[model samples]
Target chain A: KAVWDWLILLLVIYTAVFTPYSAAFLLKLAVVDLIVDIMFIVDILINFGRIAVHYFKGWFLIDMVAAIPFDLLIGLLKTARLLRLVRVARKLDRYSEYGAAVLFLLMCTFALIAHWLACIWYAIGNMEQPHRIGWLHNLGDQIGKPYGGPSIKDKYVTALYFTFSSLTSVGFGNVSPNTNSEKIFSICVMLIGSLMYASIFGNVSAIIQR
Target chain B: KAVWDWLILLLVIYTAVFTPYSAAFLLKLAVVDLIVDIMFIVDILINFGRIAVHYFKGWFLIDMVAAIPFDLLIGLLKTARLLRLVRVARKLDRYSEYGAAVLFLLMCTFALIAHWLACIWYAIGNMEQPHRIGWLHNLGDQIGKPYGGPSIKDKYVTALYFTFSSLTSVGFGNVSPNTNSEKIFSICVMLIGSLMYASIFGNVSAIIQR
Candidate 1:
């Protein structure tokens, strides 16, 4: 088992390093590829005695089964090198608590800043486009309507507002950014907001128990 | 200065306790009402020296400014409640380093869950809706598409999808639930996700530190 584990680990490491370069061929690998890859790594670690001893209990067995994907069962498979990189990077969280917290904060902050910039760009771009109405009038119309309009200044204010709102899950739709940029920005805001909130909360809770 | 601070604190406390019961003009009160009320309580504790002294630098200045809203004109306002809250919450990171780390992880988890649920709800709600045709196939479309089509099974799937998407921030834009029940459920998911993530991370980080 130990020897098999080492072999699998080496294979996985090799694949991890080389898969990105051979993207065209790897694209055909399907969900089964992911499942096999994950299982191989986990099996190797367990057999090599890297897994915590306490995790050898009954529930751990269930967890192991649940964690490893049955690729044949999942009908759809989407794979991206960036996403795989993220999955690999997440492993670093286990190394140091402080590192994880800092990483979490940094990611959230990055999302917030990126969304803000995107919102601003979208609003400015939209404002420059020719419309029958002026920017302020358009803004007034947007606000009066159920889903508000997007004026130039709203790009900044609205983005800031949306960032906080999405972060808090307020979701007050009176003033939403309408451009594609704004929409994309919102996705980031929501994603990052949820992650940052969860990570911070988790970190704090862990501290309290100690 | 100290005497004036005590008087202001009394005013804030009086408003905090009494404003909620004042039916005649209660709704007219803005956020100022809540801010003043909290400031008074903090002031009383600080003045009396009942609270710990370790927070003297970060919180004391903010508490003092919170007591005097007018001080904001002199740039002291930057240290007011909003900024103070951020600083104070950040201090939590220092006292419980491991807990903070776990909190960060849990925050990410909650965000992911929430986003996933929102996406699924969107997708389920719009499966056959005409308005949801074409480029609307993305996660954002799930959010905006009107929901009129689909049967009971669709609704259930949508709800389930929403439950998990919002839990994970998948926001696939396929289905959504429109009734108040669904909204409340969404809120519940968010609240639970937030609290659980916060608590779990706090405890985990603490344990790691220990």
Candidate 2:
């Protein structure tokens, strides 16, 4: 049971962090989900008598929903697989209070990390927008050709720094957004940063008080 | 017990908004705290036979500490008021899932509203500081026709726009942080703004997942 619980957590975390595009990951994704699907089927069968509520309660419904696309899932779909995270939460709940709190914080942060990555990706691709303002657009000392957008390397590194800077809300006014969409996107990031702090505060205090 | 809860709640909330004031409001402050203090003593009587854990003792001390004259207390007490957010969160929890969502949303927005308010206040108050940079400082006319700082009505709305715009990182460069300290302050707001966003996204999606 512990192994199954940890396996699912790994799958969700990996799905978030495995950023290099690849077919190999998908092959493994299909393999892992297939194993997970079989495991859940077994879980459902075992639960028929395990908890006396039989198959109608507890992990039954959660695992059933999570098992559906397992054999057919890949990459990001594996993240979607956390539809079963209810089971994960329950498993952690029974395991330990510390475990539950840790799980809660990890789950919260996992989502935010993915969000940060996605936002960076968008800003980089759109960095070359013609109507964009500020020195950021003109800032490529050696990145992608002007208007062509930067090379992926330049884009990634520059995006990392510029975007990270935005998080500080100091919003340097040095490297800045050019277009309206970028502004909207930047706003989105700012809101995300604020939410992150508040919830982290929530999470920490919850653990401390509990 | 609930009265004590709400009483402590009142104290924490007031501290956040306890702005700089002369003695004019002292009567009202005294009236409110005396009632609360009386209520607290009554609560102690009711819980006389309860466990040591029954009433958290620290909250009582917190009230006393905060009741010290506001003239000598500023930033830390102001931030301490937000301790009420925890109570707000708990109250929201008992209210409903939607209540928690709204509370979560409100808590984040509270930080933002104040952020916006602070940014505007600073921008206006410091718009003409000698070492400040960009169109923001340059755009302002002389304030202290006798030391009025900056023109309030004209600059308030303009400063709001510029601050929010800078937040978008679309920073127009039309307005910018002028001095080293202003730049530092700008960065602090930006980071606060961004982290707020991240946590909100975390909370929103977690609720959805739940």
Candidate 3:
């Protein structure tokens, strides 16, 4: 069960980190998604019928939606795959009594926060009109490359940079928000960043003091 | 004693937040400094001689140096005034058993981290040759103002913006490092930022969980 949870954790991270770019690339790794979807489907079959009483916690439908390849019907349905995290979350506290385990969970949670926000940041940039002077355009101008060009890795890195910078409250402003949409998005991230900063540091201090 | 500590807290904040700009403005409020310096000096005389046994814990020198107003002999001596935090730090744990008080202290500590770094960021920009590209110059260019010409408030704000951005890890890149010194300084802030982020959030989580 621990190994399976770890696998699901890795898959969630992979989906959060790569889905933005892959969506732009038109399902760049559909085969891998297919395998992941099959795993989720089989996971449901292994639990829901056998442990019908336990599975009635209403997570079954979420698991079914998360497992099904809804992207075949809707372009952005890969987001549905993220619902799998609900299952993962339910199992996380089993090891909460272990300080190291709690610490590890916190670190993973922090990383996932950044990962999810980074994907959203990337999506926001892509959603903006090409002519706007947003971070994406700012980045394009800096590297002398057009948007959606050869510097895809740099694009992902910059997205991660922007998210990490905002989440940590460093905000260097090289790739700041230009459009109103970007500004509102930034405000949300800043709010989350402040809360995350407090929660993370508070727990770390508590652990050390203990 | 509570009121005295709280007053000192405000003064320390005042010194940390405004000292950078005041130094650049050539002691813009020397009278205020004179008054503050007197308060600090009086603070020492009231403690060291009367409480000879308890005061001998070795913080006397830090308190003295912090209070003495060494700026007359050295240009950047206001930096020494920050050592008053040592006194403040020693007294902080009195209320640690109260969750609200601990939270308050953590918030103050977080703000001070950003404040000190912002001051250093400004000082570094000033230390650089005016012609070199840096966040200071970047701000000037953005506002159509020449370096050291006008718009000084924006300079401090931008410095805070940069430090907070770096500290929180938002790194908008609007006023990013261009010079080697700036980059190195940024690296230090990033390291501190990561630690601060972890420490602050961890303790917060612990408190809420409790």
Candidate 4:
């Protein structure tokens, strides 16, 4: 379980950070995506054999959903991968007695959310290019280049930078919503951020009080 | 105590929303600020009489700090009022037996955080005007007018819009940081947003699980 849990965590994290970018950049990391799907499929197979009744009777549906090879247009498959964190979180319970450990786990969880959101931000930016607007177009304009001129790393970082800015509420106003779609997307993210803030504050208070 | 608790909550909420804007807009609402401070001061006096030893022996310093009339350049006194929420939160515990109530309080708390952050965002934008490069300047340029051309309501709403954008992790990029100061501030907000995301996620889980 130890090695398996760690492996699953690694795969999940990798998928989280990778899938969004792949979709946004229109990058074909088919082999890489396929490998991850296969690994999850294998995991399901192993679990099925060990606890055939439990696997079949109960909800191992998420595992199957995550293992499906088809990619989603909006990266829903990538989001499905995040659901695997539910299983992985059990391992973290071993360290729940320790405040800092629990906090570290929470922080990791928080980062993953931001990272995924960053991917979504870029995807939306890319989607808005047809309208000749959004952060991607704006980025190109600011940098004196074509929309696709920036390196993948540069684009990813900027996307992440924009997400972090929004996530944090510092919103420096460098990369802002230009279109209605972008504005709507921004609203959803802000609501998520607000909820996240409260949840974190409550958990930390509970932990400290404990 | 019921009346007092509600009063304090109202005062704190008022301060949270109002102080930042007052500072940002440079609005000299001395009479209003003075009234709130006096209310807090009077409350402190009542508490002191009720339990003089507890009032002085334990740390009532937060209450004192909050009641102070002196407003810092950064609106620290206003921030101090937020601490009074510690006492106010106890009232919320009466409703803790209900999940919806707990969630409501949390949502309110989240909104306050966003509102306060919005104020700070505007204040920072106002501060950077001397440098002639920031969201405020950019907003001016976009609107085809001078920095102070917009109405107070327009400016406040824009500030709130930016903060909400950042807070929720939408970061539409329309209103973004330009100055180094704004950038640094944005970084801090992102960290806050990240932590908030976790805390909210944790609390919601806890409530649902319970």
Best by DockQ: 3
Residue B147's C-alpha lDDT in candidate 3? 59
In every candidate, how many clashes are there?
84, 31, 45, 25
Q: What is the full ranking by lDDT, best candidate first? A: 3, 4, 2, 1
**Model 1, B1-210: lDDT tens per residue?**
545543553453344333322321122155766676565666546544534566675456666654555532333232233332333243344434445554554444454344445444444334434533322233234334343433333333334434544554344343334545545656776787666655654554455445
lDDT of 2 at A172: 53
Per-residue lDDT, model 3, residue A33, is: 76
Q: Largest lDDT belongs to which candidate?
A: 3
lDDT of 2 by residue, B1-210 (tens): 555655655554553343322111111255864664465445444543455455546354553443343455343344443443454444554335555645555554554454445444454345445533543354442222233433443344345445565444445463566666667767876786566545655555456335
B81-176: candidate 3 lDDT, tens digit per residue: 657767667876664768998888788778877877887787778777454366666687787886564465787788887787777666666778
Better of 1 and 3 by TM-score: 3
The RMSD of every model to the true structure, in order and in angstroms, is 19.5, 13.1, 10.5, 10.9
Which ten-residue region of model 4 chain B has the weakest summed lDDT? Answer: B71-80
Q: In angstroms, give how far residue A116 of model 2 lies from its true place.
A: 5.0
Badly placed stretches (over 4 Å) of model 4 are: A27-29, A49-51, A71-82, A89-103, A146-148, A177-184, A194-210, B1-96, B105-210
lDDT of 1 by residue, A1-210 (tens): 535533543444444443432332222244655666677556536643445665564234533443454445132222232223333243444424565555554455455444544444434434544431222333456666322345345544544554555566565655443433344445555556555565555555555566
Regions of candidate 3 where Cα sits further than 4 Å from its true position: A24-28, A48-50, A71-73, A146-150, B1-192, B196-210
Per-model DockQ against the true two-chain complex: 0.05, 0.09, 0.21, 0.18
- Candidate 4, residues A1-210, lDDT tens digits: the string is 657866877787787666665655754376887888788788777776456877677657766775665543445445555566566655565647679877876787788788888877878776666754567776877777775567677778888887777777677777776554566677677777756755675687777898
Q: What lDDT tens digits, residue by residue, belong to model 3 across residues A1-210?
A: 767766766776676656655665344367887887777676677665556977767688677667766633366666666677777677766557678777677766776687678777877777674544778777766555665652656666667666766776666665688889889999999998899977886676667665
